[PDB]
Amino acid sequence: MSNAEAFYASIRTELESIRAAGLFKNERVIATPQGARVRTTDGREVINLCANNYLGLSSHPQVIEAAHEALRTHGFGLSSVRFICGTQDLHKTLEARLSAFLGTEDTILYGSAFDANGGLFETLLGAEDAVISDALNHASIIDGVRLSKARRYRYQHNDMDDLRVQLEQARADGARYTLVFSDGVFSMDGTVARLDEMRAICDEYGALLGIDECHATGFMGQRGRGTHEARGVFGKIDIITGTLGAALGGASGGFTSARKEVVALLRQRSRPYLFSNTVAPAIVGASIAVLDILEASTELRDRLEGNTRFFRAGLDRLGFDVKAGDHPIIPIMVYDADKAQQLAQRLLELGVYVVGFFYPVVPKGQARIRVQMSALHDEAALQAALDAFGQAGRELGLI
Amino acid sequence: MSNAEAFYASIRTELESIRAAGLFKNERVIATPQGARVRTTDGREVINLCANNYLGLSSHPQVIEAAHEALRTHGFGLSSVRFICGTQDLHKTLEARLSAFLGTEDTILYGSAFDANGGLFETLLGAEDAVISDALNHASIIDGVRLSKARRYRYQHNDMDDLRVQLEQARADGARYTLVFSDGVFSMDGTVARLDEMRAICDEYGALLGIDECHATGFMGQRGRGTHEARGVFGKIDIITGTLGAALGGASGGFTSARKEVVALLRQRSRPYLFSNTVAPAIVGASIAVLDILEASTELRDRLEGNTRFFRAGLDRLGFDVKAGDHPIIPIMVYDADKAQQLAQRLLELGVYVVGFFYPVVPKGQARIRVQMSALHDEAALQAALDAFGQAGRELGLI
Ligand SMILES: Cc1ncc(COP(=O)(O)O)c(CNCC(=O)O)c1O
Ligand SMILES: Cc1ncc(COP(=O)(O)O)c(CNCC(=O)O)c1O
C-alpha cells in the first residue's frame, strides 16, 4: 500500500460511513427552468417548495430578457478581476442602485455572498480587534472570520443577554474595534435577528453592526429592503453583505454594502475582489432590471408574505410545529435524519419537491425539511402541497 | 469621539496611506464587450492586452448564442445550492465533459476557482496531514489551506530540490497523507510548474499532486488540455482545481476534478458546494459549447501560441527582459509602483490597455505590467502594440 492509495481508502471509508449514518446527499436532476413548478429528468412535474427564489425572479421573463440584452450589448464573459479590465459601466450602475436600495453610501460586487463574507473581516479588522457572531452564523461568515486575525466571540442564538456578555468580555479583553455580526434572517431556522435591540446594544459599547441579508433582501420589510428595514434600523447598519443569488435573480453574484471608505478599502485590499473574476455582464445587467422591478411595486413582496401567511396557517392547522405567521423559511423539524430523508422522498411521490436537511448542514439530532415559500405559488399548488404534507405527515407519524 | 467613528477614521487614514504609497487602484469603466479591442466610456478604443480571455471565447458568437439558448431552455438563475434544487441536467453534462477533457474520473462545479480552492483542503485533509505549496501559489490556494487543519510546508518557487527538502521534513514530522499543491501556470510571472519532475518526486514519497489550472485550461498542451498535458502527465494528476472565467468563457464558475471518491466527498462536505449558489444555467450551457469548440479544433490555442511567440520575441528585440516565447503571460517588471501606473497610463494614451500590478497583488518593490496574450489579436494590433511598448518603454527608461 502506498500513502496516496491509502488516502483514497480513507476517503472511500468516509464516504461509506456517511451513507451508513443516513447522511448521504443525493442530487435531483431538474430538466426545466427554476419555477414554482418544475420537472426532473424523469418527466415528473412537482411543486418546488425549497428554492431561494422567493420573489420568482429566477425565471422572470423581464429578468430573462434583461440577460439577453446585456449579452447583446456587453458580451458573455469579462475574464478579468475588477481592477484590470473587469469593470463595465454595468457594475458601477448596479453598485449605485444597490446602495440606494439598501440605504448605504457605496457597494462592492463579489462573485458570491460566500466571497463577500470571505473577504470582509480580514480586510477591515486586525489582531487588536474583535468580531462577535451569533452562534448560528452562516458558514461563509465563520470562514471569513477564520481568515481574519481578529479575536472571536460567539453569543447564543438570538440571545441579547449573551450578546451583552460577550461584548463585556471583548472589551475586558482589550478589544480596539468591535464588530457584531449576524445573519439578518437565519438560513436554517427562519428566525429574524433582533437588529433593533442589537443596534441599541452596539451603540452602548461603541461596536459596529454588520448583517448578512441573503434571506432578506428583496422581501423583508414593507418595501423589501431587508431585515434592517423590518427592524426599524434602515440607514443604521454599518455593514451589509448579501447575495444576488437568492431573491434578486438567483443566477450568481454577491455584494458588500457599507460607507464609502469601507467599500473603498475592500476594493484595494479584499482578496476575492483582487484575485477572483468579476460578475458576468448578463448577471449585472439582469440585476439592474431586478431593482427596477422591486422599486416599482411591492406586489411580489406582498404576495410572498400572503402565500407565507396562508401556508403557515395551513401547517399549523394540520398539527405540524410551525409558528404560523410570516417567515418564508418554514423549518419542519424532524430531528432524525432518516425521517427527513423519508419525508422528502414520500412528498416527492405525492408531487412536492423538498429536500432533507441533515448534518453537516444542520446539527445532528436536529434534521429538518426547510420549506421555502415563493411569491410564484398559486392557491392550487399551495392547497395541493398542504394535502401532500397532511398525508405524508400522517403516514410517517409526524402528526 | 466614538469607537465606531474612530474605526472609520482608521479606514480613512489607511486609504490615504495606500494612495501616498502609490498603491491605490482606480477602475477603468469599459463600455463594450470583452475583446481584443475595447472601448472605455470616454470613447477611446484601445488594444486589450491584460484579460484572461486567452482563447477569445469571452465574446465568441457561438458562446454568446449558447448562453442565449440556455436562458431560453433552462432559465436565468437556479437560486439554490446543488443538493437542494440547484442541479440541472446541464451541470451533470458539463461535469462529465470536463472530466473527459481533463483526464479525470469526475468533476465538481463551484461558483469560482477561488471557492474550489477554498473548499478543497479542509474537506480532504486533517491535522494529521500535510500540504506542500510552491511559495508563489495563488491567494485562493493559501486561503483554502489556511481553512484546513493540515500542516503547511512551502518550497521555493519552482525549486525541485527544495520540494524534496519539504517532503523529507513532512515525512520526518510524521505526516499521514501529503498533498503537493501548485499553480499549473503561475498568475504573476507566467512560469510553468515542473509537473513532470513533481509527479516523479511525489511518487517517491507517495505524496499526492494537485494543481491549480486557471491559467492553463483550454490552451496549455498540444490539445489545450492543461499544464499536465504540456508536461506529459495527463491522467496522472490527483487533483485539478480550475476556473471557467479565464480561457473557458470568462463569465463565472470553477471546478475541482479528481477520482470519483474525492469528488463525491467534495459534494458531501465541501463548504462552498453545500452553502453557496450553483453555477447559473447560461454559464453551464455556454461552457458545454466552449468544450464543443475546443474539442473540435486546436486553431484558437494555436493562434494564441503564435501571437505570444511573436509578441515575446518582439519585446525581446526591443530590449525588454522578456525571453523565449510561448508563455501567454508576459511580465514586464517596473518594481516602482508609480512607474507601474505611469507605464500603464502612457500605454493607454498610445492605444494599449494594460494595468499596473503592485502590492498586495505582487510584493512591495516588485511592481509590474502583466501583459496577457489572446488568440483574438491580428498582427496589425500586435504590431501597433509593439510600437506602443517600444515608445513608452524608452520614454520611461525601461529600454
Ligand atoms: C491561479 C489562480 N487560481 C484561482 C483563481 C480564482 O479564479 P476565479 O476567477 O475562478 O475565482 C485565479 C484568478 N486570477 C485572476 C488573475 O490572475 O487575474 C488564479 O489566477
Ligand atoms: C446567510 C447566507 N449567507 C451567505 C450565503 C452564500 O451566498 P452565495 O450563494 O451568494 O455564495 C448563503 C447561501 N445560502 C444557501 C441556502 O440557504 O440554501 C446564506 O444562506
Q: Are residues B343 and B353 in the same domain?
A: yes
Give SS3 for B342.
helix
For A228, the grid coordinates are 434592517
A131-141 burial, b for 16+ CB within 10 Å, e for fewer? bbbbebbbbbb
Q: Which residues are CB-neighbours of A176 under 8 A, at least 6 positions away?
A: A126, A128, A129, A130
Domain boundary among B296, B319, B337: B296
Q: How many whole angstroms from B241 Cα to the centroid of ligand 1? A: 10
- Residue of A25, A54, A114, A136 to test ligand 2 pocket, by largest number of atoms within 8 Å of CB: A114
In this structure, chain B runs to a length of: 399
Whether the bond between B281 and the residue before it is cis, its omega within 30 degrees of 0, is: no
Q: Are residues A156 and A91 in the same domain?
A: yes
* Position A95 in a domain: yes
- Which chain B residues are within 8 Å of A27, Cβ to Cβ? 82-83, 87, 267
Q: Are residues A291 and A303 in the same domain?
A: no
CATH number at residue A28: 3.90.1150.10
Taking the Cβ of residue A200 and every Cβ of chain B, the question of whether any pair is shorter than 8 Å is answered with no
- B231 touches B196 (CB < 8 A): yes
Q: Are residues B31 and B66 in the same domain?
A: no
- B102 touches B263 (CB < 8 A): no
Q: What is the dihedral of CA B3, B8, B12, B18, to 10 degrees?
A: 90
* Position A10 in a domain: no
* Position B271 in a domain: yes
* Position A221 in a domain: yes
Q: How far is CA B94 from CA A257, A287, B306, in A?
A: 34, 25, 29
* Position A13 in a domain: no
Beta strands A45-48 and A352-353 are parallel
How many Cα neighbours within 13 Å face the side chain of B39? 9
* Residue A246 per-residue DSSP state: S
Q: Are residues A32 and A86 in the same domain?
A: no
Method: X-ray
For B275, the grid coordinates are 452553502
Q: How far apart are CA B38 and CA B50, in angstroms?
A: 11
Q: Are residues B198 and B267 in the same domain?
A: yes
CB pairs under 8 A between A and B: 349
* Position B17 in a domain: no
Whether the bond between A360 and the residue before it is cis, its omega within 30 degrees of 0, is: yes
Query: Residue A208 is which amino acid?
Result: L
- φ, ψ of residue A255 to 5 degrees: the values are -165, 160
Distance from CA of A50 to the nearest CA of B (A): 7
Q: Are residues B31 and B168 in the same domain?
A: no
Q: Are residues B100 and B122 in the same domain?
A: yes
- Helix B281-296 vs helix B299-317: angle between axes, to the nearest 10 degrees? 80
Domain boundary among B274, B296, B318: B296
Distance from CA of B358 to the nearest CA of A (A): 11
Q: How far apart are CA B98 and CA B82, in angstroms?
A: 17
Q: How far is CA A90 from CA A241, A395, B20, B42, B166, in A?
A: 20, 52, 30, 15, 47
Q: Are residues B272 and B143 in the same domain?
A: yes
Q: Are residues A45 and A82 in the same domain?
A: no
Residues of the domain holding B271: 61-296
- Residue contact A77–B252, C-beta within 8 A: yes
Q: Give me the residue from B112, B118, B271 closest to A277, CB to CB.
A: B112
- Which chain B residues are within 8 Å of A276, Cβ to Cβ? 112-114, 140
* Position B76 in a domain: yes
- Domain count within chain B: 2
CATH number at residue B187: 3.40.640.10
Cell numbers 415559500 correspond to what residue?
Answer: A373
A196, with CB counted inside 10 A (0-12, 13-18, 19+), is middle
Q: What is the DSSP string of B35-70?
A: SSEEEBTTS-EEEE-S-S-TTSGGG-HHHHHHHHHH
Q: Which residue of A has its CA nearest to B374?
A: A79
* Position A18 in a domain: no
CA A30 centroid distance within chain? 21
Does residue B81's CB lie within 6 angstroms of at least one atom of ligand 2? Answer: yes
Taking the Cβ of residue A375 and every Cβ of chain B, the question of whether any pair is shorter than 8 Å is answered with no
Q: How far is CA A244 from CA A58, A283, B305, B368, in A?
A: 10, 9, 38, 34
Q: Are residues B88 and B161 in the same domain?
A: yes
Alpha-helical segments (H) within chain A: 3-20, 61-74, 89-102, 113-118, 121-124, 139-147, 160-172, 195-205, 227-230, 260-269, 271-275, 281-296, 299-317, 337-349, 379-395
Give SS3 for A192.
strand
* Residue A277 per-residue DSSP state: P
Cβ atoms within 10 Å, residue A150: 24
Taking the Cβ of residue B215 and every Cβ of chain A, the question of whether any pair is shorter than 8 Å is answered with no
- φ, ψ of residue B47 to 5 degrees: the values are -85, 125
Q: Are residues B111 and B192 in the same domain?
A: yes
Q: How far is CA A73 from CA A7, A110, A316, in A?
A: 49, 22, 50
Domain boundary among B266, B281, B296: B296
